[PDB]
Amino acid sequence: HELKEALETLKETGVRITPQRHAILEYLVNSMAHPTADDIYKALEGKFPNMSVATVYNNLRVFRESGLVKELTYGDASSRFDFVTSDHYHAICENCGKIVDFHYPGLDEVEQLAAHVTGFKVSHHRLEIYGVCQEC
Amino acid sequence: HELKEALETLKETGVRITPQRHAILEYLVNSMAHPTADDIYKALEGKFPNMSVATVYNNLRVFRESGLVKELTYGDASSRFDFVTSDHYHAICENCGKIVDFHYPGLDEVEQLAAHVTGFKVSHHRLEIYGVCQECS
Ligand SMILES: [Mn+2]
Ligand SMILES: [Mn+2]
Ligand SMILES: [Zn+2]
Ligand SMILES: [Zn+2]
Numbered sequence: 001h002e003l004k005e006a007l008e009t010l011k012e013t014g015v016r017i018t019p020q021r022h023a024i025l026e027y028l029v030n031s032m033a034h035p036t037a038d039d040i041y042k043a044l045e046g047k048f049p050n051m052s053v054a055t056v057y058n059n060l061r062v063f064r065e066s067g068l069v070k071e072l073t074y075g076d077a078s079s080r081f082d083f084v085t086s087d088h089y090h091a092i093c094e095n096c097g098k099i100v101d102f103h104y105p106g107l108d109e110v111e112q113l114a115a116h117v118t119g120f121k122v123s124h125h126r127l128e129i130y131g132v133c134q135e136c
Numbered sequence: 137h138e139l140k141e142a143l144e145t146l147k148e149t150g151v152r153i154t155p156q157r158h159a160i161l162e163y164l165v166n167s168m169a170h171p172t173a174d175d176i177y178k179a180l181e182g183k184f185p186n187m188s189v190a191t192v193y194n195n196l197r198v199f200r201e202s203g204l205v206k207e208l209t210y211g212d213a214s215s216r217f218d219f220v221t222s223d224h225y226h227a228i229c230e231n232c233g234k235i236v237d238f239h240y241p242g243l244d245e246v247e248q249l250a251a252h253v254t255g256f257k258v259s260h261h262r263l264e265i266y267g268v269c270q271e272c273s
Contacts, residue, residue, distance in 0.1 A: 051223035075211075077267065091250045091258075093202045104246050110265050114227045118236045120267035122227075129246060131256035 002029050002085060006068050012067040020048050021059050028063075034072060034080045034099045072099075075095040096136040102129075137217075138165045149202040157195055164205060164219040170235045172214050172254050204273050208235075227265040232272040238265075 006025060010017055021049070023044055032037065037056045061082060063069045072080035072090075080099070082088070091100045115122040142161060146153055159180050169175065173192045180187070197215055199205040208216035208226075216235070218224075227237045244261075251258040 012245060017204075025230075030152070091254050091256055093256070094259060100250070100256065102246075102250050102253050104249060110225075110227070110240055113240060114225075114238045114265045116250065117238050118227050118238075118267075119270050120227060120229070122264075122267040123230060125263065127261065127267045129250045129258060129261045130254075131251070131255075131258035134255055135257075 001082075009066060009068055015062060015066065020044075020051050020055075023048065024056065024059055025063075025068075028069060028081065028083050031099075034082055036078045036080055038078065043120055089129065091131065093133050093136060095132055096129055098133065098136070145202060145204055151198060151202065156180075156187050156191075157198075159184060160198075161162055161193065161204075161219075164199075164217065168237075170208060170216045170218045172216055174214070176217075185236075225263060225265075227267065229272060230266050230268050231268055234269065234272070 003026065006029075007017060007022075010021075015021075018106055021047075022062050024040060025044060027040055028035070031039075031043075035043075036062060040060075041051075041053045042057050044056075060069065060071070064071050064081075068084060070082045070084050072082060074080075087103075089104055091102055092098070110117075111122040111125060114120060139162065141179060142165075143153060143158075146157075151157075159182075163176055163179060164171070167175075167179075171179075173189055173196060176196075177187075177189045177192050180192075196205065196207075199206060200207050200217075205223075206218050206220050208218060210216075225240055226232070227236050227238055240263075247258045247261055250256060
């Protein structure tokens with residue numbers, strides 16, 4: 001399980017798992033959205049009455065640092081979060097902004113090709129597909 | 137041809153070409169960098185003593201709107217600009233931010249595949265490749 005593994009990964013970097021830090025994870029696993037802190041907040045305010053939104057935004061910043069989630073920094077504005085379940089391409093709606101998952105290998109090529117044509121130690125690549133829902 | 141065609145396209149949407157508006161283009165064609173307003177500014181302050189940075193930032197915003205240049209919005213603070221041609225790929229330096237340009241036909245595949253697996257009216261795609269120089273340079 002993705003819970004099981006992730007929970008051990010926290011232990012590994014030190015991070016102790018309080019009941020709320022757990023609740024945030026279980027949510028990130030189950031919710032096949034790409035939620036923002038506030039969606040996590042209002043979903044979990046439960047239940048966790050004394051937890052602030054910044055605190056969500058902090059736990060997430062912990063999880064990010066220990067490679068248990070990616071921060072979709074784009075853009076503006078508020079930030080979205082995936083879960084490094086891996087991996088993974090993003091198709092976004094130009095209108096509502098929803099984020100269907102989808103996979104496509106491969107893929108390299110560049111890495112490999114550009115590495116050739118530019119003389120660059122290629123770290124990784126980012127690929128986004130844009131369109132519309134579903135309408136929306 | 138580069139200039140010739142572009143100059144005609146301004147004429148097309150109406151936009152009149154003053155000496156400075158011209159100087160900006162010739163620069164954008166010649167400089168196979170992906171300059172920012174300020175690189176264009178300090179390069180052309182010349183020569184064009186009375187033209188402000190915002191003015192550059194405006195003519196470029198004109199050129200953008202009439203599809204003669206793309207604005208590399210990413211990111212944070214300053215914006216980069218690339219004189220549109222065809223059609224087109226970017227590999228970025230994680231250290232100094234240099235932008236080479238490569239080409240990988242193609243393409244698509246998805247676009248097409250995703251369109252199938254998600255039920256989307258796929259407009260376009262964006263692809264960057266990240267690495268390091270060259271060391272840098
Ligand atoms: Mn995703
Ligand atoms: Mn380019
Ligand atoms: Zn939509
Ligand atoms: Zn570099």
